[PDB]
Design a protein around this ligand. Sequence first.
Ligand SMILES: O=C1N[C@]2(C[C@H](C3CCC3)C2)C(=O)N1c1cncc2ccccc12
Ligand SMILES: O=C1N[C@]2(C[C@H](C3CCC3)C2)C(=O)N1c1cncc2ccccc12
Lengths: 301, 301
Amino acid sequence: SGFRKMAFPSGKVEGCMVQVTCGTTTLNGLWLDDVVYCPRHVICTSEDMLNPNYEDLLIRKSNHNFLVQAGNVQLRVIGHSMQNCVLKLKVDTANPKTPKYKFVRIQPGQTFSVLACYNGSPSGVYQCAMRPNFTIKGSFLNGSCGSVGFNIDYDCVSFCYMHHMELPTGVHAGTDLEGNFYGPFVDRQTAQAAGTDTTITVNVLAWLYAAVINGDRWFLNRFTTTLNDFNLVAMKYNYEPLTQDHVDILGPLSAQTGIAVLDMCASLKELLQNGMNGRTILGSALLEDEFTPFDVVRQCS
Amino acid sequence: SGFRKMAFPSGKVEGCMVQVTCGTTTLNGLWLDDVVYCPRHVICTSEDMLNPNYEDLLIRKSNHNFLVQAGNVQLRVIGHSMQNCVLKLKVDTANPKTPKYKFVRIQPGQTFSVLACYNGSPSGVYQCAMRPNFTIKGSFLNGSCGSVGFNIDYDCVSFCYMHHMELPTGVHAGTDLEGNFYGPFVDRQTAQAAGTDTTITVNVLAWLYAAVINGDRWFLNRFTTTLNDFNLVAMKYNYEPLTQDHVDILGPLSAQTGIAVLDMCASLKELLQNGMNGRTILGSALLEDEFTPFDVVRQCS
Ligand SMILES: O=C1N[C@]2(C[C@H](C3CCC3)C2)C(=O)N1c1cncc2ccccc12
Ligand SMILES: O=C1N[C@]2(C[C@H](C3CCC3)C2)C(=O)N1c1cncc2ccccc12
């Protein structure tokens, strides 16, 4: 019993973290096979961050300008290209610690584990969610840049996130491993709008199922409701609209608790309208939206 | 910027987790050098759990009865002893993945990382605290038993916790790595009282410093107070009494924020008396007590 924001074990990713230096700038890189991946802003001097021409900056750079360290061992850079907002440095050595892996673009609402690093050394691991507005609320300091997010299916690491920026508002933006930003962000030091963040409704319902499963049942009410009536309330409170896809992926949790999705939706409606009244659910005084129905099922299995 | 319940990277401990079978019973063990450590209740059949004589049960057991698996590789058990509530199985192979490590008995209020395992496979990592009443509020299923808690100082893993039991009340009890329980618990299936849990006051103050440092300042008030006056309020609300030791370890955070400990204490007094009023601090509607002043300093450094 019990329910915790649990991260995937980080071992497989620790053995891939390297330090990448280019002039004065140091940040983290991801060493898979004979390629190192990092944010391309490693080639920027602080004086170019307002509006860098990344091509033009990269053009004044040759292989030997890139200092890739893995612990003690230096690596030799025998090729460099720029793919969207990441540098791919081809090195002489295949990573002997390279796990099985894929690159995946996740969708807003999905969760992943983050290994927060500094100078190519892992410092910490936490679980978080791609917010609907494609930001993440992480824990990143200067030099955390290039820190990666991942899921682990069996022996297979799926890398979904590389950290590039903290926004003027204190939240975090980054790319997939092909260097395409999540959201409307660019790797420039300008004031950039995140947009309105909404609550991931399907996740809040998964958490409610998690709570029922762990003995917290007080919010269960006599009522039920409609997908339409529910979504009307959802929009008022900046909750994402709930679809039949969402109802479908909540099925296993419906099945295990013997509570219909729409009766759970009706409990949620009331919590939204009446607040928590001073009560708590799985030790929280706030509605949690950073567990997927998959995360709840995994932890409860 | 940002603030997250961050765990230590788990890599160094993944390479130590093994499966231990004795009859029908399987749980996790910790393979360091030529010794495997696990909970001694691995020798119990479900019918002996009411009141086992562990000596007498161990006596009807020889080396070959113990099935220690590390991935695929079986290990050979050439010696077994019982130290308080753990089995030490001496095996033929030194763990080649053995990190530098110590065994440490932590104090209530201190935090550690937990690698939750099933059948000697790591599933998940989360951060938690030894509650004042020596329980932990973890996330453990059947077969999670033998899952370990640890801190990482540089290259040195300090193991502090081995998981033995969920209590009838849904919370978690376990031992240090020498097999001595934290708290008044025994490895018997009886109803056992945890006792009154209190809030770790020094941790709540560290979290408030964490919040000031990350731009959340609304709870800062005009008042100040006294260690005596404060502790009077602390006791009313089941907060641990604050000592000059606590004031002293909050010094670095005092120094960085330019806020005196006792002015922070006065902010806390008011939050305790007035509640949060619907506001939040670092995205929480509740006072968080599972970061130490060390944890706050590490994450903020
Ligand atoms: O280290 C850098 N450097 C840039 C990238 C730079 C931008 C992109 C081109 C101009 C500025 C940054 O966003 N940060 C930080 C990242 N994550 C957490 C931080 C916390 C505090 C300070 C900087 C952070
Ligand atoms: O697997 C066991 N077996 C014992 C140890 C057994 C006690 C100690 C002698 C009698 C009973 C146990 O406490 N659990 C669980 C542990 N952690 C989370 C669980 C969650 C659900 C069910 C059992 C759990």
